[PDB]
Amino acid sequence: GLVPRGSHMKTLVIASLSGGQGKTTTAFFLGKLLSQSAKVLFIDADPQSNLTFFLGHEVEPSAPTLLELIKDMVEPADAVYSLANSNQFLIPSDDGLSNAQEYLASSGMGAVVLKARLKPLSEYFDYCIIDSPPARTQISIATIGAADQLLIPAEASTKGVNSLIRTLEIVQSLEKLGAFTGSILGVIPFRDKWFGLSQSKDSAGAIAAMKEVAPQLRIFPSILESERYKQALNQGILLSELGYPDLEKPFEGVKEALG
């Protein structure tokens, strides 16, 4: 049973055209951090289902997940599961989430299907954090449509700059069509390589080119390349709890920009 409150749930989406463990990382640590003093709803919109795994949830056989919520086969709240933490909940994903592609496309309003599905939950949480799939897919675009704020991780590399660009053009076209009504929180570069005191010229350049391509956008302190992210993720804890609080700073920065 879900306790309703005075809350008007603010939906944040971590979206980026290309394949990146950057979104899932950013969704995990950012959600966990928001849940310190707020009620947070995680949505795992990637058919790879990592966020669901990292948050330590397993989907039982006849259990309704995101797929069932998208296809209107179940009340929204029946796809919301409680987590270990008392402030964190999860609309999971497993195997067949990709069957949502056909359903969404053929509906003729894919990009706003999820936005609709989640309205009912508006009063029950303070935040919704969506980890979107690593492609242009129907789903990909339904998450963007659902967003009040959009956060775009981008690899500090040429591939990352090109992905930032394709993502902004996808967003713009959804805005023109009326699907995307939110604003863009900013870009958060990731896999930024440093060699002690000097950063990789390649990373410095990509990040410099991000500010050029999108001078209107805010570019957050970046996520250093580091195995720690994967280590904490694996044991389901924050980076500060693992012992490396500096790495947590760029996520703190994002939290502070939502308040």
Side-chain angles (χ1 to χ4, degrees), residues 1-2 4-16 18-259:
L2 279 163
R5 22 192 289 159
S7 58
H8 320 283
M9 177 190 235
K10 176 176 193 177
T11 304
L12 169 69
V13 181
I14 322 301
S16 184
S18 67
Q21 35 177 76
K23 323 142 333 188
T24 288
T25 292
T26 304
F28 186 88
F29 296 120
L30 181 48
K32 290 190 94 252
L33 293 174
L34 286 159
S35 82
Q36 282 170 354
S37 58
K39 229 191 167 193
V40 168
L41 177 59
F42 287 105
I43 302 180
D44 188 11
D46 191 335
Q48 285 301 329
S49 301
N50 284 320
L51 190 67
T52 294
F53 170 76
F54 285 149
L55 292 171
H57 185 278
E58 29 201 352
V59 169
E60 277 159 352
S62 234
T65 83
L66 181 59
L67 174 60
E68 283 75 25
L69 171 61
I70 283 171
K71 301 168 87 152
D72 208 16
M73 306 179 146
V74 74
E75 303 261 27
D78 295 339
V80 171
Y81 299 82
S82 197
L83 295 178
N85 183 303
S86 49
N87 278 353
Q88 299 170 7
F89 300 80
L90 172 70
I91 299 179
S93 95
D94 60 16
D95 286 18
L97 168 67
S98 45
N99 293 317
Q101 236 83 250
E102 208 278 346
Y103 173 99
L104 281 166
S106 73
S107 80
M109 295 298 266
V112 297
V113 162
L114 190 59
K115 184 192 268 181
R117 258 30 148 196
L118 301 178
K119 257 149 185 142
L121 303 186
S122 160
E123 270 160 4
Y124 298 58
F125 305 88
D126 301 303
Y127 294 103
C128 184
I129 315 277
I130 306 180
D131 176 15
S132 64
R136 192 199 302 237
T137 68
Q138 283 303 323
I139 297 168
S140 198
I141 300 170
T143 59
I144 298 185
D148 297 307
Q149 304 257 21
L150 178 76
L151 179 81
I152 304 168
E155 195 181 81
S157 83
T158 316
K159 160 181 152 167
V161 180
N162 290 337
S163 175
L164 168 69
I165 276 156
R166 288 178 205 106
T167 298
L168 287 182
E169 89 194 7
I170 296 179
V171 176
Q172 178 180 8
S173 86
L174 289 160
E175 176 166 323
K176 281 195 171 203
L177 288 172
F180 180 69
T181 49
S183 69
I184 295 175
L185 183 55
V187 183
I188 177 161
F190 75 92
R191 192 169 264 109
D192 180 13
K193 199 164 192 173
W194 286 69
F195 299 105
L197 301 131
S198 43
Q199 71 168 346
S200 169
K201 301 178 68 186
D202 298 326
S203 297
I207 293 187
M210 269 161 34
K211 306 168 198 268
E212 189 185 26
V213 169
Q216 350 87 23
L217 288 193
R218 177 176 172 185
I219 316 276
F220 292 96
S222 58
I223 305 182
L224 296 199
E225 174 159 317
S226 174
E227 286 195 42
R228 298 310 186 183
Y229 302 114
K230 185 144 55 195
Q231 182 180 5
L233 277 171
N234 283 331
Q235 283 108 68
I237 67 190
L238 287 171
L239 282 165
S240 57
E241 303 175 318
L242 176 79
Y244 305 84
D246 268 2
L247 298 186
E248 205 155 83
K249 291 204 176 206
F251 303 117
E252 273 301 343
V254 177
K255 175 172 169 177
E256 171 263 320
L258 289 171

PDB file of all heavy atoms in Angstrom, residues 161-190:
ATOM      1  N   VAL A 161      30.462  13.386 -27.872  1.00  0.00           N
ATOM      2  CA  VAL A 161      29.990  14.674 -28.356  1.00  0.00           C
ATOM      3  C   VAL A 161      28.934  14.473 -29.431  1.00  0.00           C
ATOM      4  O   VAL A 161      27.913  15.157 -29.439  1.00  0.00           O
ATOM      5  CB  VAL A 161      31.112  15.539 -28.893  1.00  0.00           C
ATOM      6  CG1 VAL A 161      30.548  16.848 -29.371  1.00  0.00           C
ATOM      7  CG2 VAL A 161      32.124  15.795 -27.807  1.00  0.00           C
ATOM      8  N   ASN A 162      29.169  13.510 -30.321  1.00  0.00           N
ATOM      9  CA  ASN A 162      28.215  13.208 -31.383  1.00  0.00           C
ATOM     10  C   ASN A 162      26.895  12.700 -30.818  1.00  0.00           C
ATOM     11  O   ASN A 162      25.826  13.018 -31.337  1.00  0.00           O
ATOM     12  CB  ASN A 162      28.788  12.204 -32.395  1.00  0.00           C
ATOM     13  CG  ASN A 162      29.904  12.800 -33.263  1.00  0.00           C
ATOM     14  OD1 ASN A 162      30.000  14.020 -33.446  1.00  0.00           O
ATOM     15  ND2 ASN A 162      30.750  11.926 -33.809  1.00  0.00           N
ATOM     16  N   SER A 163      26.970  11.921 -29.749  1.00  0.00           N
ATOM     17  CA  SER A 163      25.766  11.446 -29.078  1.00  0.00           C
ATOM     18  C   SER A 163      24.988  12.582 -28.404  1.00  0.00           C
ATOM     19  O   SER A 163      23.759  12.634 -28.471  1.00  0.00           O
ATOM     20  CB  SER A 163      26.116  10.372 -28.052  1.00  0.00           C
ATOM     21  OG  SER A 163      24.961  10.004 -27.319  1.00  0.00           O
ATOM     22  N   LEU A 164      25.697  13.488 -27.745  1.00  0.00           N
ATOM     23  CA  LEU A 164      25.046  14.657 -27.188  1.00  0.00           C
ATOM     24  C   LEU A 164      24.271  15.392 -28.285  1.00  0.00           C
ATOM     25  O   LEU A 164      23.174  15.897 -28.057  1.00  0.00           O
ATOM     26  CB  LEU A 164      26.074  15.596 -26.563  1.00  0.00           C
ATOM     27  CG  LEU A 164      25.496  16.967 -26.212  1.00  0.00           C
ATOM     28  CD1 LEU A 164      24.511  16.840 -25.069  1.00  0.00           C
ATOM     29  CD2 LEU A 164      26.582  17.944 -25.858  1.00  0.00           C
ATOM     30  N   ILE A 165      24.851  15.452 -29.480  1.00  0.00           N
ATOM     31  CA  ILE A 165      24.257  16.202 -30.580  1.00  0.00           C
ATOM     32  C   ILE A 165      23.004  15.532 -31.125  1.00  0.00           C
ATOM     33  O   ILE A 165      21.987  16.189 -31.363  1.00  0.00           O
ATOM     34  CB  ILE A 165      25.245  16.388 -31.717  1.00  0.00           C
ATOM     35  CG1 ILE A 165      26.132  17.588 -31.432  1.00  0.00           C
ATOM     36  CG2 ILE A 165      24.498  16.624 -33.012  1.00  0.00           C
ATOM     37  CD1 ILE A 165      27.455  17.531 -32.149  1.00  0.00           C
ATOM     38  N   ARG A 166      23.081  14.224 -31.331  1.00  0.00           N
ATOM     39  CA  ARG A 166      21.912  13.492 -31.781  1.00  0.00           C
ATOM     40  C   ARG A 166      20.827  13.540 -30.724  1.00  0.00           C
ATOM     41  O   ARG A 166      19.646  13.558 -31.047  1.00  0.00           O
ATOM     42  CB  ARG A 166      22.247  12.044 -32.139  1.00  0.00           C
ATOM     43  CG  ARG A 166      23.049  11.907 -33.419  1.00  0.00           C
ATOM     44  CD  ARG A 166      23.397  10.450 -33.712  1.00  0.00           C
ATOM     45  NE  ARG A 166      24.601  10.350 -34.534  1.00  0.00           N
ATOM     46  CZ  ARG A 166      25.787   9.956 -34.079  1.00  0.00           C
ATOM     47  NH1 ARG A 166      25.928   9.606 -32.804  1.00  0.00           N
ATOM     48  NH2 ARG A 166      26.828   9.905 -34.903  1.00  0.00           N
ATOM     49  N   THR A 167      21.213  13.568 -29.457  1.00  0.00           N
ATOM     50  CA  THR A 167      20.204  13.582 -28.410  1.00  0.00           C
ATOM     51  C   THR A 167      19.455  14.909 -28.390  1.00  0.00           C
ATOM     52  O   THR A 167      18.236  14.939 -28.245  1.00  0.00           O
ATOM     53  CB  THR A 167      20.798  13.271 -27.041  1.00  0.00           C
ATOM     54  OG1 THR A 167      21.348  11.948 -27.064  1.00  0.00           O
ATOM     55  CG2 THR A 167      19.717  13.338 -25.983  1.00  0.00           C
ATOM     56  N   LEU A 168      20.184  16.004 -28.557  1.00  0.00           N
ATOM     57  CA  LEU A 168      19.563  17.317 -28.538  1.00  0.00           C
ATOM     58  C   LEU A 168      18.623  17.504 -29.719  1.00  0.00           C
ATOM     59  O   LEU A 168      17.633  18.234 -29.633  1.00  0.00           O
ATOM     60  CB  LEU A 168      20.626  18.404 -28.538  1.00  0.00           C
ATOM     61  CG  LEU A 168      21.381  18.571 -27.227  1.00  0.00           C
ATOM     62  CD1 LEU A 168      22.378  19.694 -27.322  1.00  0.00           C
ATOM     63  CD2 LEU A 168      20.402  18.841 -26.101  1.00  0.00           C
ATOM     64  N   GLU A 169      18.932  16.850 -30.832  1.00  0.00           N
ATOM     65  CA  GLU A 169      18.090  17.006 -32.008  1.00  0.00           C
ATOM     66  C   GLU A 169      16.837  16.150 -31.867  1.00  0.00           C
ATOM     67  O   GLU A 169      15.771  16.530 -32.355  1.00  0.00           O
ATOM     68  CB  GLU A 169      18.866  16.769 -33.323  1.00  0.00           C
ATOM     69  CG  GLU A 169      18.912  15.331 -33.855  1.00  0.00           C
ATOM     70  CD  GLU A 169      19.975  15.125 -34.949  1.00  0.00           C
ATOM     71  OE1 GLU A 169      20.775  16.057 -35.204  1.00  0.00           O
ATOM     72  OE2 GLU A 169      20.013  14.022 -35.544  1.00  0.00           O
ATOM     73  N   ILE A 170      16.952  15.022 -31.163  1.00  0.00           N
ATOM     74  CA  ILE A 170      15.777  14.196 -30.861  1.00  0.00           C
ATOM     75  C   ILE A 170      14.858  14.910 -29.887  1.00  0.00           C
ATOM     76  O   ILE A 170      13.643  14.863 -30.015  1.00  0.00           O
ATOM     77  CB  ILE A 170      16.134  12.856 -30.224  1.00  0.00           C
ATOM     78  CG1 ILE A 170      16.949  12.000 -31.176  1.00  0.00           C
ATOM     79  CG2 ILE A 170      14.880  12.100 -29.884  1.00  0.00           C
ATOM     80  CD1 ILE A 170      17.355  10.666 -30.560  1.00  0.00           C
ATOM     81  N   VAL A 171      15.446  15.562 -28.899  1.00  0.00           N
ATOM     82  CA  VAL A 171      14.662  16.300 -27.924  1.00  0.00           C
ATOM     83  C   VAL A 171      13.935  17.438 -28.622  1.00  0.00           C
ATOM     84  O   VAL A 171      12.742  17.649 -28.421  1.00  0.00           O
ATOM     85  CB  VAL A 171      15.550  16.865 -26.787  1.00  0.00           C
ATOM     86  CG1 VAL A 171      14.725  17.708 -25.849  1.00  0.00           C
ATOM     87  CG2 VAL A 171      16.245  15.733 -26.023  1.00  0.00           C
ATOM     88  N   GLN A 172      14.654  18.176 -29.454  1.00  0.00           N
ATOM     89  CA  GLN A 172      14.042  19.318 -30.108  1.00  0.00           C
ATOM     90  C   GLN A 172      12.828  18.903 -30.933  1.00  0.00           C
ATOM     91  O   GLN A 172      11.819  19.609 -30.980  1.00  0.00           O
ATOM     92  CB  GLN A 172      15.042  20.064 -30.987  1.00  0.00           C
ATOM     93  CG  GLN A 172      14.402  21.230 -31.715  1.00  0.00           C
ATOM     94  CD  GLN A 172      15.376  21.974 -32.594  1.00  0.00           C
ATOM     95  OE1 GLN A 172      16.517  21.542 -32.778  1.00  0.00           O
ATOM     96  NE2 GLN A 172      14.935  23.104 -33.145  1.00  0.00           N
ATOM     97  N   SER A 173      12.913  17.748 -31.575  1.00  0.00           N
ATOM     98  CA  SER A 173      11.840  17.345 -32.462  1.00  0.00           C
ATOM     99  C   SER A 173      10.637  16.895 -31.645  1.00  0.00           C
ATOM    100  O   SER A 173       9.494  17.059 -32.070  1.00  0.00           O
ATOM    101  CB  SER A 173      12.311  16.272 -33.452  1.00  0.00           C
ATOM    102  OG  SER A 173      12.192  14.975 -32.900  1.00  0.00           O
ATOM    103  N   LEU A 174      10.893  16.352 -30.459  1.00  0.00           N
ATOM    104  CA  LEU A 174       9.804  15.984 -29.558  1.00  0.00           C
ATOM    105  C   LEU A 174       9.178  17.221 -28.932  1.00  0.00           C
ATOM    106  O   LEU A 174       7.977  17.256 -28.674  1.00  0.00           O
ATOM    107  CB  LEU A 174      10.285  15.035 -28.475  1.00  0.00           C
ATOM    108  CG  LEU A 174      10.630  13.629 -28.936  1.00  0.00           C
ATOM    109  CD1 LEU A 174      11.530  13.023 -27.888  1.00  0.00           C
ATOM    110  CD2 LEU A 174       9.366  12.795 -29.149  1.00  0.00           C
ATOM    111  N   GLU A 175       9.996  18.237 -28.689  1.00  0.00           N
ATOM    112  CA  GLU A 175       9.464  19.501 -28.219  1.00  0.00           C
ATOM    113  C   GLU A 175       8.536  20.112 -29.264  1.00  0.00           C
ATOM    114  O   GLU A 175       7.421  20.492 -28.939  1.00  0.00           O
ATOM    115  CB  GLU A 175      10.579  20.476 -27.871  1.00  0.00           C
ATOM    116  CG  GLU A 175      10.063  21.841 -27.469  1.00  0.00           C
ATOM    117  CD  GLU A 175      11.128  22.694 -26.799  1.00  0.00           C
ATOM    118  OE1 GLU A 175      11.952  22.141 -26.029  1.00  0.00           O
ATOM    119  OE2 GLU A 175      11.133  23.923 -27.037  1.00  0.00           O
ATOM    120  N   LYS A 176       8.987  20.193 -30.516  1.00  0.00           N
ATOM    121  CA  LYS A 176       8.162  20.752 -31.593  1.00  0.00           C
ATOM    122  C   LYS A 176       6.835  20.019 -31.717  1.00  0.00           C
ATOM    123  O   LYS A 176       5.819  20.641 -32.008  1.00  0.00           O
ATOM    124  CB  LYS A 176       8.880  20.708 -32.943  1.00  0.00           C
ATOM    125  CG  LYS A 176       9.909  21.807 -33.180  1.00  0.00           C
ATOM    126  CD  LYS A 176      10.281  21.871 -34.668  1.00  0.00           C
ATOM    127  CE  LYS A 176      11.126  23.096 -34.991  1.00  0.00           C
ATOM    128  NZ  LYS A 176      11.019  23.463 -36.433  1.00  0.00           N
ATOM    129  N   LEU A 177       6.844  18.702 -31.501  1.00  0.00           N
ATOM    130  CA  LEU A 177       5.623  17.901 -31.603  1.00  0.00           C
ATOM    131  C   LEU A 177       4.743  17.937 -30.351  1.00  0.00           C
ATOM    132  O   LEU A 177       3.650  17.381 -30.352  1.00  0.00           O
ATOM    133  CB  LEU A 177       5.955  16.449 -31.959  1.00  0.00           C
ATOM    134  CG  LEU A 177       6.416  16.232 -33.396  1.00  0.00           C
ATOM    135  CD1 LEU A 177       6.906  14.825 -33.618  1.00  0.00           C
ATOM    136  CD2 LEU A 177       5.266  16.555 -34.324  1.00  0.00           C
ATOM    137  N   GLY A 178       5.228  18.566 -29.281  1.00  0.00           N
ATOM    138  CA  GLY A 178       4.479  18.682 -28.032  1.00  0.00           C
ATOM    139  C   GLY A 178       4.622  17.554 -27.010  1.00  0.00           C
ATOM    140  O   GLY A 178       3.941  17.562 -25.973  1.00  0.00           O
ATOM    141  N   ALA A 179       5.502  16.590 -27.292  1.00  0.00           N
ATOM    142  CA  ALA A 179       5.752  15.465 -26.388  1.00  0.00           C
ATOM    143  C   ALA A 179       6.616  15.893 -25.202  1.00  0.00           C
ATOM    144  O   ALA A 179       6.316  15.585 -24.039  1.00  0.00           O
ATOM    145  CB  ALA A 179       6.419  14.313 -27.134  1.00  0.00           C
ATOM    146  N   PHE A 180       7.690  16.610 -25.506  1.00  0.00           N
ATOM    147  CA  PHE A 180       8.594  17.088 -24.479  1.00  0.00           C
ATOM    148  C   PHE A 180       8.206  18.489 -24.050  1.00  0.00           C
ATOM    149  O   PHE A 180       8.301  19.434 -24.829  1.00  0.00           O
ATOM    150  CB  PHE A 180      10.034  17.067 -24.985  1.00  0.00           C
ATOM    151  CG  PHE A 180      11.030  17.551 -23.979  1.00  0.00           C
ATOM    152  CD1 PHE A 180      11.298  16.808 -22.851  1.00  0.00           C
ATOM    153  CD2 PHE A 180      11.691  18.751 -24.156  1.00  0.00           C
ATOM    154  CE1 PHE A 180      12.209  17.253 -21.920  1.00  0.00           C
ATOM    155  CE2 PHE A 180      12.605  19.196 -23.231  1.00  0.00           C
ATOM    156  CZ  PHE A 180      12.861  18.451 -22.112  1.00  0.00           C
ATOM    157  N   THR A 181       7.777  18.609 -22.800  1.00  0.00           N
ATOM    158  CA  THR A 181       7.316  19.874 -22.243  1.00  0.00           C
ATOM    159  C   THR A 181       8.205  20.342 -21.103  1.00  0.00           C
ATOM    160  O   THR A 181       7.954  21.381 -20.499  1.00  0.00           O
ATOM    161  CB  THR A 181       5.940  19.690 -21.647  1.00  0.00           C
ATOM    162  OG1 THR A 181       5.960  18.530 -20.801  1.00  0.00           O
ATOM    163  CG2 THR A 181       4.939  19.476 -22.747  1.00  0.00           C
ATOM    164  N   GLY A 182       9.233  19.563 -20.798  1.00  0.00           N
ATOM    165  CA  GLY A 182      10.132  19.888 -19.708  1.00  0.00           C
ATOM    166  C   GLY A 182      11.274  20.781 -20.130  1.00  0.00           C
ATOM    167  O   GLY A 182      11.266  21.336 -21.226  1.00  0.00           O
ATOM    168  N   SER A 183      12.255  20.932 -19.251  1.00  0.00           N
ATOM    169  CA  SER A 183      13.456  21.671 -19.595  1.00  0.00           C
ATOM    170  C   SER A 183      14.684  20.767 -19.469  1.00  0.00           C
ATOM    171  O   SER A 183      14.604  19.664 -18.923  1.00  0.00           O
ATOM    172  CB  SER A 183      13.603  22.885 -18.689  1.00  0.00           C
ATOM    173  OG  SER A 183      13.891  22.473 -17.370  1.00  0.00           O
ATOM    174  N   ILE A 184      15.822  21.231 -19.973  1.00  0.00           N
ATOM    175  CA  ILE A 184      17.032  20.422 -19.923  1.00  0.00           C
ATOM    176  C   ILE A 184      17.899  20.873 -18.762  1.00  0.00           C
ATOM    177  O   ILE A 184      18.397  22.000 -18.747  1.00  0.00           O
ATOM    178  CB  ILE A 184      17.841  20.518 -21.230  1.00  0.00           C
ATOM    179  CG1 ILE A 184      17.060  19.922 -22.402  1.00  0.00           C
ATOM    180  CG2 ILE A 184      19.173  19.807 -21.093  1.00  0.00           C
ATOM    181  CD1 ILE A 184      17.754  20.091 -23.749  1.00  0.00           C
ATOM    182  N   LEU A 185      18.070  19.986 -17.788  1.00  0.00           N
ATOM    183  CA  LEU A 185      18.805  20.308 -16.580  1.00  0.00           C
ATOM    184  C   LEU A 185      20.246  20.602 -16.937  1.00  0.00           C
ATOM    185  O   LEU A 185      20.864  21.526 -16.406  1.00  0.00           O
ATOM    186  CB  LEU A 185      18.739  19.128 -15.621  1.00  0.00           C
ATOM    187  CG  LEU A 185      19.380  19.262 -14.242  1.00  0.00           C
ATOM    188  CD1 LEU A 185      18.837  20.469 -13.503  1.00  0.00           C
ATOM    189  CD2 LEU A 185      19.104  17.996 -13.449  1.00  0.00           C
ATOM    190  N   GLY A 186      20.782  19.807 -17.856  1.00  0.00           N
ATOM    191  CA  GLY A 186      22.164  19.964 -18.265  1.00  0.00           C
ATOM    192  C   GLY A 186      22.824  18.706 -18.787  1.00  0.00           C
ATOM    193  O   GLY A 186      22.192  17.660 -18.922  1.00  0.00           O
ATOM    194  N   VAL A 187      24.107  18.827 -19.107  1.00  0.00           N
ATOM    195  CA  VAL A 187      24.905  17.698 -19.547  1.00  0.00           C
ATOM    196  C   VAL A 187      25.876  17.335 -18.439  1.00  0.00           C
ATOM    197  O   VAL A 187      26.435  18.215 -17.784  1.00  0.00           O
ATOM    198  CB  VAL A 187      25.723  18.061 -20.792  1.00  0.00           C
ATOM    199  CG1 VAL A 187      26.482  16.856 -21.278  1.00  0.00           C
ATOM    200  CG2 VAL A 187      24.812  18.578 -21.881  1.00  0.00           C
ATOM    201  N   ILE A 188      26.076  16.040 -18.225  1.00  0.00           N
ATOM    202  CA  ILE A 188      27.085  15.590 -17.280  1.00  0.00           C
ATOM    203  C   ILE A 188      28.090  14.664 -17.964  1.00  0.00           C
ATOM    204  O   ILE A 188      27.785  13.524 -18.284  1.00  0.00           O
ATOM    205  CB  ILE A 188      26.462  14.941 -16.014  1.00  0.00           C
ATOM    206  CG1 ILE A 188      27.558  14.416 -15.086  1.00  0.00           C
ATOM    207  CG2 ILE A 188      25.505  13.837 -16.380  1.00  0.00           C
ATOM    208  CD1 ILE A 188      27.082  14.191 -13.665  1.00  0.00           C
ATOM    209  N   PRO A 189      29.288  15.183 -18.235  1.00  0.00           N
ATOM    210  CA  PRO A 189      30.272  14.375 -18.953  1.00  0.00           C
ATOM    211  C   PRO A 189      30.730  13.215 -18.098  1.00  0.00           C
ATOM    212  O   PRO A 189      30.814  13.364 -16.880  1.00  0.00           O
ATOM    213  CB  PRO A 189      31.434  15.354 -19.191  1.00  0.00           C
ATOM    214  CG  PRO A 189      31.187  16.517 -18.290  1.00  0.00           C
ATOM    215  CD  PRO A 189      29.715  16.583 -18.064  1.00  0.00           C
ATOM    216  N   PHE A 190      31.020  12.077 -18.718  1.00  0.00           N
ATOM    217  CA  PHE A 190      31.496  10.943 -17.953  1.00  0.00           C
ATOM    218  C   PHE A 190      32.663  10.225 -18.616  1.00  0.00           C
ATOM    219  O   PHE A 190      33.000  10.515 -19.763  1.00  0.00           O
ATOM    220  CB  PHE A 190      30.348  10.001 -17.527  1.00  0.00           C
ATOM    221  CG  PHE A 190      29.796   9.129 -18.619  1.00  0.00           C
ATOM    222  CD1 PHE A 190      30.303   7.856 -18.833  1.00  0.00           C
ATOM    223  CD2 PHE A 190      28.702   9.544 -19.382  1.00  0.00           C
ATOM    224  CE1 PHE A 190      29.757   7.026 -19.836  1.00  0.00           C
ATOM    225  CE2 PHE A 190      28.146   8.717 -20.381  1.00  0.00           C
ATOM    226  CZ  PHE A 190      28.673   7.463 -20.608  1.00  0.00           C
TER     227      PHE A 190
END
